[PDB]
Amino acid sequence: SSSIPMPAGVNPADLAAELAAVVTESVDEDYLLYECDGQWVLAAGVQAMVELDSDELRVIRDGVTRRQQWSGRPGAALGEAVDRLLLETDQAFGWVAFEFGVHRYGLQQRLAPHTPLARVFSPRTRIMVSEKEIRLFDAGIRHREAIDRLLATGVREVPQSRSVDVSDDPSGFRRRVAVAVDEIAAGRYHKVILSRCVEVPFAIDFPLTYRLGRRHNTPVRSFLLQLGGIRALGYSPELVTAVRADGVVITEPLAGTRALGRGPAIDRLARDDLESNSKEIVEHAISVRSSLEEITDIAEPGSAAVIDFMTVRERGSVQHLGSTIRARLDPSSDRMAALEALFPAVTASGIPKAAGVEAIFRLDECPRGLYSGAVVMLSADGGLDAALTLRAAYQVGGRTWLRAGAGIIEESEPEREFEETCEKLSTLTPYLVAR
Numbered sequence: 001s002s003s004i005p006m007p008a009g010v011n012p013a014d015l016a017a018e019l020a021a022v023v024t025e026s027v028d029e030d031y032l033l034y035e036c037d038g039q040w041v042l043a044a045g046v047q048a049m050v051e052l053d054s055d056e057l058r059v060i061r062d063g064v065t066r067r068q069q070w071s072g073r074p075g076a077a078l079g080e081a082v083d084r085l086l087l088e089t090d091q092a093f094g095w096v097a098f099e100f101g102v103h104r105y106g107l108q109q110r111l112a113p114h115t116p117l118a119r120v121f122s123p124r125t126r127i128m129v130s131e132k133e134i135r136l137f138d139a140g141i142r143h144r145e146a147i148d149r150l151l152a153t154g155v156r157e158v159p160q161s162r163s164v165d166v167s168d169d170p171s172g173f174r175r176r177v178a179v180a181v182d183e184i185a186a187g188r189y190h191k192v193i194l195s196r197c198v199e200v201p202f203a204i205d206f207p208l209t210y211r212l213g214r215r216h217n218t219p220v221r222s223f224l225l226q227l228g229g230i231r232a233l234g235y236s237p238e239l240v241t242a243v244r245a246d247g248v249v250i251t252e253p254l255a256g257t258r259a260l261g262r263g264p265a266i267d268r269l270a271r272d273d274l275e276s277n278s279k280e281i282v283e284h285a286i287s288v289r290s291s292l293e294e295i296t297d298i299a300e301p302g303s304a305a306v307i308d309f310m311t312v313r314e315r316g317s318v319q320h321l322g323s324t325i326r327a328r329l330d331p332s333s334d335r336m337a338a339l340e341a342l343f344p345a346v347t348a349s350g351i352p353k354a355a356g357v358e359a360i361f362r363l364d365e366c367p368r369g370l371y372s373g374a375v376v377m378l379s380a381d382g383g384l385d386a387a388l389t390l391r392a393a394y395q396v397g398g399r400t401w402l403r404a405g406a407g408i409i410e411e412s413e414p415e416r417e418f419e420e421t422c423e424k425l426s427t428l429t430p431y432l433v434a435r
Helices: 012-027 074-088 141-153 173-185 206-214 264-276 278-296 335-342 353-363 414-425
Strands: 002-005 031-036 039-053 057-061 064-068 091-096 116-129 133-137 191-199 221-227 230-236 239-243 248-251 254-259 305-315 318-328 374-379 384-388 392-396 399-408
Touching: 012 031, 012 039, 012 116, 012 141, 012 206, 012 221, 031 091, 031 116, 031 374, 031 384, 039 074, 039 091, 057 074, 074 091, 074 116, 074 335, 074 374, 091 221, 116 141, 133 141, 173 191, 173 353, 173 399, 173 414, 191 353, 191 414, 206 221, 206 230, 206 392, 221 374, 221 384, 239 335, 248 278, 254 264, 254 278, 254 414, 264 278, 264 305, 264 318, 278 305, 278 318, 278 335, 335 384, 399 414
Parallel strands: none
Antiparallel strands: 002 133, 031 039, 031 221, 039 057, 039 116, 057 064, 091 116, 091 374, 116 133, 191 399, 221 230, 230 392, 239 248, 239 384, 248 318, 254 318, 305 318, 374 384, 392 399
8 A cells, every 4th residue: 555646737537537548558457436535546457246136146256256146135135245345355346226226115026137236346456546646555566557657648638529419319208208297197106217318329438538527527426437348437416325434324315407507697597596496496305305214214213314405516517406314324224225225316216216116117218227326335344335326428338328317297398308308418418538
């Protein structure tokens, strides 16, 4: 565990993303870059991988695949495997699918064979980039050498971006929204979040796109990854779960959206609209009530509280009403139970949860996979940090795509909901670097 001062001209996000690119170039390894409270943590190389699927748990290390069957809660299975990783390393990193959340609501029967639930690895090396210093954990001579070369050449200039059209509706989001509105009017549920994919018809450079978008966003967490054939990046607007080593558990429901980034006065008009708009206030209050009910399932009695209520949270191309809910983890619970209790995020699924999540199987493109799941960083001291995976781009096989959604309630209209998806997609769409 050594350290290097940070060069002077240079932003931690830019240097961390460039490192991720340099190390791909040199050593051809998987990685996950996770930004958490001014630390850009590059988890580089896979020492061991835990793959949780609907029908199997695998642990893979140094060639060898151990296969195990599992029953009961997916969080119990994942927790057993991850807690073992964390005997050998201080931190473990990866992603949790939307589909991980469905067991709690009696929907396990619906997942196809081999449906991914989670991928969580211990890195070979961590490099931690912050405003002051670069810290190196377990870096090998080959890696330090290429860090030293990066510092010698400086960061690349980011090229001009290349645009994508989001105005088309190949998946029939507007039709699908109308179906949900009819269901809500008939009393099937109160709210469902539906979404649409947007295809990117060219290959993107994930690290350079990560850098360009980061200059134009203010997320709670961010990530850039290449793991098991998936490339992804995103600017997470809210925590679905964080669990501190001291047992404090946080969740951050966001509900109510307007555009941001359109000019200071226009943005202020929108803010004032949002903060005073009864429809948005009511749905925000309802969302907080639901999140509180969820966190209360894992909380020490009397410990669940709203610590920040209905405040505007600026997130690049959009601004939201947000709250922050806290509790103390009951001694009878654990970090994975806490995740499960809050999964999938109420503000990315629906209310009531079981009916809303089921509507998503019927009325959205499934599996959702990474989208509306979480990107996660777990620590040996008990920590769990789980950023909700929204405002993200993905590449798997020859397919590169974006995905965004909107909360549909009884008085929703397909046009305004499609536009809200455009607003959210604009977190990324002006910032796509080809290659």
